[PDB]
């Protein structure tokens with residue numbers, strides 16, 4: 001092993017790669033490998049091979065960074081305790097251009113709890129699902145732009161239960177920016193509904209990033225319902241958005257060599273343009289504001305006080321939470337790296353309402369600071385920027401669509417007013433304003449909306 005959680009995680013992955021190598025070496029057929037007994041033998045053989053084989057296992061781990069991350073959770077992990085008991089944590093630091101994992105946090109203390117919350121435990125991604133499964137895909141399909149309007153008007157699930165956001169049943173129309181900054185749920189619900197109505201191959205996008213979702217026909221899918229992922233895997237999703245839409249598979253083992261040089265295994269990069277560069281860079285701009293607005297996370301404030309120069313780097317991110325309060329997430333990225341973070345309880349009991357907003361945000365600011373102190377230039381000073389392929393459209397702030405004539409239950413009203421630039425990832429850009437100008441909304445909602453617009 002080159003460069004306790006670290007040892008067991010590295011060992012476990014190396015054993016899996018050794019297993020594949022040995023089975024292939026011995027010419028074991030795909031069928032004879034389906035045998036449970038045979039599988040057990042080869043898994044044990046792989047373990048023994050490493051145990052005393054003198055193999056050279058090269059990992060992607062940056063010693064100084066990983067060590068700094070361990071000292072950080074040791075000294076600052078208590079900042080996560082919010083009064084709902086011992087709060088567990090998982091973090092993964094990933095290189096955006098390669099998918100290599102430079103370091104991670106498996107939990108509060110291995111000696112007290114061996115559960116690896118960075119590589120093994122699967123939890124709902126909650127609201128961090130939105131940029132990837134809903135808004136990102138809608139933008140990529142040319143179904144919406146950066147300033148498109150969405151409905152946050154009250155609405156119910158198919159069973160009559162209202163879609164909630166804390167104790168709020170909703171408000172009204174809002175821009176994608178506001179929807180993302182606050183992480184309102186109804187707009188996400190409508191967006192996914194729109195994708196299914198248009199028959200978009202959502203599964204295709206997610207599978208290209210390695211996500212395994214068993215059922216896509218779920219109303220709350222955009223809010224993380226029906227999805228369970230490890231921090232490592234989810235960090236890979238944000239790595240994709242940060243790396244201008246190009247996915248690079250996560251990995252901790254880069255190569256395994258026998259003592260004599262024979263290559264037992266070696267990571268092979270297989271980049272995939274999941275989202276267009278236009279879509280990815282537009283999302284980066286929206287996620288930059290999610291952090292700057294400080295609506296769902298105090299992160300920017302925390303980091304500014306701890307390391308103002310590092311806070312000036314081009315940070316973008318998204319928080320994750322649901323009405324259940326069982327999982328809090330904060331995904332952060334600079335052009336060079338992505339750091340995923342999850343906190344919660346092993347038995348899934350609820351965290352305090354502000355555990356994600358304050359506690360996890362402060363802890364992660366300390367974690368980010370520790371990483372930078374250990375490796376000064378690792379985060380980078382590069383800026384995320386709009387790809388030149390991005391189409392810019394001048395639209396009304398009220399409708400998120402180009403100015404024009406619209407029929408409002410009689411009479412041809414000339415919809416005009418203040419405008420703003422909206423970014424699109426299609427060819428023609430934003431369409432002319434129509435009566436149903438927003439994503440989602442009932443007939444009544446639109447009556448109320450247009451009443452104000454005209455008013």
Ligand SMILES: [Cl-]
Pocket residue numbers: 004005006007070
């Ligand atoms: Cl460790």
